[PDB]
Amino acid sequence: DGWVKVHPTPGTMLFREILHGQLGYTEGQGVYNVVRSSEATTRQLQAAIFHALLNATTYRDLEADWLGHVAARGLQPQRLVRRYRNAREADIAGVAERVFDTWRNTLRTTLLDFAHGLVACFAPGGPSGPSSFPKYIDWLTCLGLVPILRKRQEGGVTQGLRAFLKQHPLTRQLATVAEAAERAGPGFFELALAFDSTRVADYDRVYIYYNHRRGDWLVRDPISGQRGECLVLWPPLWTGDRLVFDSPVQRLFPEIVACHSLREHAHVCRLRNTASVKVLLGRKYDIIDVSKSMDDDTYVANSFQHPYIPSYAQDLERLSRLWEHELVRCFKILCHRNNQGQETSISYSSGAIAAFVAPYFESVLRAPRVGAPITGSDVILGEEELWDAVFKKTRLQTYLTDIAALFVADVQHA
Amino acid sequence: DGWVKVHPTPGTMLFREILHGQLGYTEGQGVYNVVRSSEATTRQLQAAIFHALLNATTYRDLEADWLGHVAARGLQPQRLVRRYRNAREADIAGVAERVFDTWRNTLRTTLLDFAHGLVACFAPGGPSGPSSFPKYIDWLTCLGLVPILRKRQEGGVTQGLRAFLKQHPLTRQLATVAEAAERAGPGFFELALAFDSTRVADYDRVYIYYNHRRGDWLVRDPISGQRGECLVLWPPLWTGDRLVFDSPVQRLFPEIVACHSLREHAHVCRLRNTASVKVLLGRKYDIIDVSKSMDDDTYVANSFQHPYIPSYAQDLERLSRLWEHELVRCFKILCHRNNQGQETSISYSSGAIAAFVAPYFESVLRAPRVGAPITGSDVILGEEELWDAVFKKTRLQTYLTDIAALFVADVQHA
Numbered sequence: 001d002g003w004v005k006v007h008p009t010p011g012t013m014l015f016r017e018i019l020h021g022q023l024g025y026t027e028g029q030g031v032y033n034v035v036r037s038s039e040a041t042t043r044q045l046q047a048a049i050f051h052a053l054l055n056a057t058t059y060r061d062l063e064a065d066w067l068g069h070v071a072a073r074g075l076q077p078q079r080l081v082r083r084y085r086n087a088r089e090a091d092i093a094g095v096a097e098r099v100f101d102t103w104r105n106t107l108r109t110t111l112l113d114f115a116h117g118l119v120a121c122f123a124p125g126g127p128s129g130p131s132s133f134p135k136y137i138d139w140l141t142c143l144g145l146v147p148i149l150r151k152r153q154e155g156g157v158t159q160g161l162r163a164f165l166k167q168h169p170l171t172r173q174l175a176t177v178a179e180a181a182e183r184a185g186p187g188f189f190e191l192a193l194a195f196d197s198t199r200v201a202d203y204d205r206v207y208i209y210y211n212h213r214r215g216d217w218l219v220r221d222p223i224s225g226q227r228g229e230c231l232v233l234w235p236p237l238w239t240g241d242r243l244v245f246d247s248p249v250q251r252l253f254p255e256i257v258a259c260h261s262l263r264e265h266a267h268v269c270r271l272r273n274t275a276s277v278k279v280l281l282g283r284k285y286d287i288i289d290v291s292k293s294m295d296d297d298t299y300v301a302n303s304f305q306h307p308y309i310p311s312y313a314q315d316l317e318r319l320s321r322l323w324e325h326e327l328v329r330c331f332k333i334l335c336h337r338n339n340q341g342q343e344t345s346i347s348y349s350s351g352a353i354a355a356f357v358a359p360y361f362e363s364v365l366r367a368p369r370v371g372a373p374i375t376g377s378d379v380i381l382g383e384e385e386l387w388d389a390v391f392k393k394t395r396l397q398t399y400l401t402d403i404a405a406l407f408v409a410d411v412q413h414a
Numbered sequence: 415d416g417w418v419k420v421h422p423t424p425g426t427m428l429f430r431e432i433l434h435g436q437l438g439y440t441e442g443q444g445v446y447n448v449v450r451s452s453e454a455t456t457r458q459l460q461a462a463i464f465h466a467l468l469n470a471t472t473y474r475d476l477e478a479d480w481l482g483h484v485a486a487r488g489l490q491p492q493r494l495v496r497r498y499r500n501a502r503e504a505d506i507a508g509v510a511e512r513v514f515d516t517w518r519n520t521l522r523t524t525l526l527d528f529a530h531g532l533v534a535c536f537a538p539g540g541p542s543g544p545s546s547f548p549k550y551i552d553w554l555t556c557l558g559l560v561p562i563l564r565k566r567q568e569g570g571v572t573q574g575l576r577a578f579l580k581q582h583p584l585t586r587q588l589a590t591v592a593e594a595a596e597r598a599g600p601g602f603f604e605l606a607l608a609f610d611s612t613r614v615a616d617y618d619r620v621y622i623y624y625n626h627r628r629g630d631w632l633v634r635d636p637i638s639g640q641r642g643e644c645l646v647l648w649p650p651l652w653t654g655d656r657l658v659f660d661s662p663v664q665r666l667f668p669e670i671v672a673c674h675s676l677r678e679h680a681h682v683c684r685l686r687n688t689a690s691v692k693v694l695l696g697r698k699y700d701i702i703d704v705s706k707s708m709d710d711d712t713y714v715a716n717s718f719q720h721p722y723i724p725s726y727a728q729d730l731e732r733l734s735r736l737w738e739h740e741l742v743r744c745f746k747i748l749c750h751r752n753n754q755g756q757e758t759s760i761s762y763s764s765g766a767i768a769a770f771v772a773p774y775f776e777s778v779l780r781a782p783r784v785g786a787p788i789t790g791s792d793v794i795l796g797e798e799e800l801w802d803a804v805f806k807k808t809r810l811q812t813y814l815t816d817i818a819a820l821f822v823a824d825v826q827h828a
Contacts, residue, residue, distance in 0.1 A: 017562065030697070071717055083477055113630060121697055130706055137726070151472060184454070194819075212618075213637065215616075226662045233542075234548070235616075237430065237617060239427065239431075244431070244434055244436075246434060250434065250435070251434065251435035251439055252435075253435075253440060254435065254436070254438065255439050256440065256683075257440070257783050264686075265684070265685070265688070268688070269608060269688060272688075272690060272699060273690070278690070278691065279691065280691065282808065287699075289699075289700050291693060291700075294702050294704070296696070298695045298704070298812075299695065299696055299697065299698045300693065300694070301694035301695060301696040301705075301717065302693075302694045302717045303691065303692075303693055304691065304719045305690060305691050306687070306690070306721050307690055308688075308721065308723075310684065310689045315729060318730070321441060322439065322440070322441050322444075325444050326439045326441075326444050326447075328447065329444045329447045329760070330444070330446060330447045332451075334759070335760070337752050337755045340753075340754065343755070349449070349759075350796055351453055354453070355451075355453075362534075362538065363538070369531065369534055371527070371530065372526065372530055372797060372798055373797070375664070395520055395523055397517045398515075398519050398520070399516075401512075402512060402513070402516055405509070405512060409498075409505065409509065413500060
């Protein structure tokens with residue numbers, strides 16, 4: 001009652017073959033390889049993990065750790081003042097500031113190592129393999145639908161997390177690290193659980209059914225028999241005895257088909273003109289035309305020759321430029337420019353990362369909220385630069401600076 | 415009695431098929447992918463929510479929170495002066511200013527977290543699904559009409575608000591934030607109800623009737639039988655025989671049709687010239703012309719040959735430029751360029767955001783209020799920078815600065 005098959009039809013297979021370059025290729029299509037890059041998602045995961053780790057810090061625990069470090073070094077301010085026996089406030093303040101700076105550097109590098117360990121643990125799951133981001137992107141590019149199958153199970157990411165966390169020696173060395181780990185454990189476990197729950201269906205196996213009257217989707221895997229959900233980003237259109245998607249490939253399809261047909265005709269015409277001389281016959285390296293079978297009681301009037309050969313450079317150039325412009329504007333890809341002449345730099349714009357990465361996490365993966373998203377510049381930015389940027393901009397720095405200021409004031413005033 | 419159907423006619427279906435690119439495609443048409451972007455509406459929602467949250471802050475609650483924080487830290491100004499025992503008012507003023515600054519940073523991060531939570535709650539349902547902004551835009555671009563259907567119901571947005579607001583622990587932490595939230599709750603509920611009540615009809619199901627004698631519109635859904643309202647932004651014209659709309663696609667239609675027909679004729683002529691030699695016959699790889707099928711008391715006088723092949727590159731280029739100029743001048747889209755490079759970025763102008771987003775919220779969504787609209791520059795800005803700007807220019811900055819100045823004066827005069 002109103003159901004119809006959508007995906008296993010030859011049209012989408014032809015779309016995917018076009019995406020693989022099975023018919024024709026152009027320089028401008030190469031931009032698509034940057035669209036599938038998994039840099040933005042990994043950067044977002046790094047930012048989320050950094051925020052989650054640094055949001056568990058406690059001021060009192062940090063103060064206790066600093067006091068313990070000072071006691072271990074035996075560098076209490078009064079002892080140093082009574083050893084130096086001078087009223088040089090600037091010198092003793094500089095000494096205390098240097099000690100605090102060394103402690104800050106050691107804490108920063110320990111936190112960086114722990115955070116990088118967490119990021120490395122989370123890395124293999126998302127960008128490739130199960131629930132891979134390029135699979136989502138080419139799902140969007142071909143159809144506009146992203147079928148998903150869900151089942152509540154454990155996975156390897158959680159196993160790696162539980163193996164790594166329990167044996168980590170950094171917890172036994174710093175109370176702050178252990179407290180942050182134990183407070184953020186449930187969140188990380190839930191995040192990995194969400195990672196391992198979802199699975200984007202492969203292109204060659206899944207089935208999609210659409211009903212026009214009710215306007216609902218059905219997606220199932222014919223092998224396992226499992227039913228899932230069908231996510232739609234831009235909806236298709238029903239024109240009666242047809243279905244027309246609004247994916248970029250759908251828009252670019254007629255031009256590609258026309259250019260391919262032109263190239264085939266050009267090749268066929270080229271192979272015809274191999275011979276140099278051609279001779280015609282009639283009723284009273286070389287190719288002969290015999291018209292005896294058709295000249296029966298017939299008289300020849302005239303004979304014309306015109307060796308036409310089509311040209312297809314302009315069509316290929318236009319198709320390449322069209323592909324580049326369509327992929328740049330549709331996915332909102334930002335290109336950096338040199339001073340003059342050529343330009344070579346491709347990255348994701350802020351609008352692109354928002355409108356594509358955020359729906360991925362929110363709906364496709366159903367992960368919990370990850371906080372404020374990164375900007376478009378942070379994708380270009382490196383790992384350590386992002387780490388110490390978020391370290392500076394977080395509230396962990398304020399407690400450390402306040403402690404340093406109070407300690408320096410107490411040292412210099414006494 | 416004067417009613418005539420409008421929308422299910424083949425003309426509008428052909429207009430939509432033109433938008434999907436059935437009748438060819440050009441690089442100029444790709445600018446349409448920026449007109450349908452949902453950045454402006456999300457920016458407006460963020461600004462409205464930020465204003466609603468910031469306007470509800472209370473001076474007395476903030477003063478009480480400041481006193482409580484001072485008591486918790488034990489930072490009584492007189493006690494600190496009696497402890498330090500020095501006449502350096504600059505040092506104590508700097509200490510108080512630093513404490514106020516750290517509290518400012520913590521309050522800012524908590525407010526940002528709560529505001530981002532609300533924005534994430536409102537985001538999924540606004541620009542897509544019900545009241546889909548791209549659907550509104552392509553309704554405007556095809557016809558000039560935006561049919562709507564309304565019903566008073568709750569929805570997922572209200573449920574998400576109910577779950578998030580009452581289960582967020584931030585309310586139990588700061589009295590000021592909870593007080594502002596409980597003041598702003600009714601407005602957020604009304605906004606969510608406005609989101610959930612309005613639905614924009616799909617292009618493939620709804621029906622539209624017009625009657626020129628009275629000048630009235632009728633819109634109905636043939637499936638559910640529900641009757642809605644028909645909104646008009648630029649009115650159409652009635653010429654007796656037909657109804658002529660004034661949407662951009664209507665103006666650009668004849669040029670598109672002419673170019674498509676020219677391309678078809680060029681292809682047909684191209685397929686004819688695949689034969690190198692052509693032969694003619696008459697009464698006393700190869701193509702034979704037997705004109706003796708008609709020869710009866712006849713005599714051949716002369717023969718001619720002229721293999722014409724039309725060219726269509728200039729037409730395609732002109733059509734692309736016309737498409738780009740029409741879209742830019744109609745939707746008022748601002749284009750940015752480098753020193754010599756073209757299309758550094760594409761963004762909505764202030765006139766565009768006003769004249770398109772504001773009528774959307776005011777009529778289609780029937781939102782109660784959106785506050786002062788943002789400029790075109792705020793679209794480029796990210797969420798965090800926009801939040802910083804609105805926080806700087808809001809009412810709350812008055813109370814915070816006044817309290818900080820008064821406390822600094824009291825500390826330095828203690």
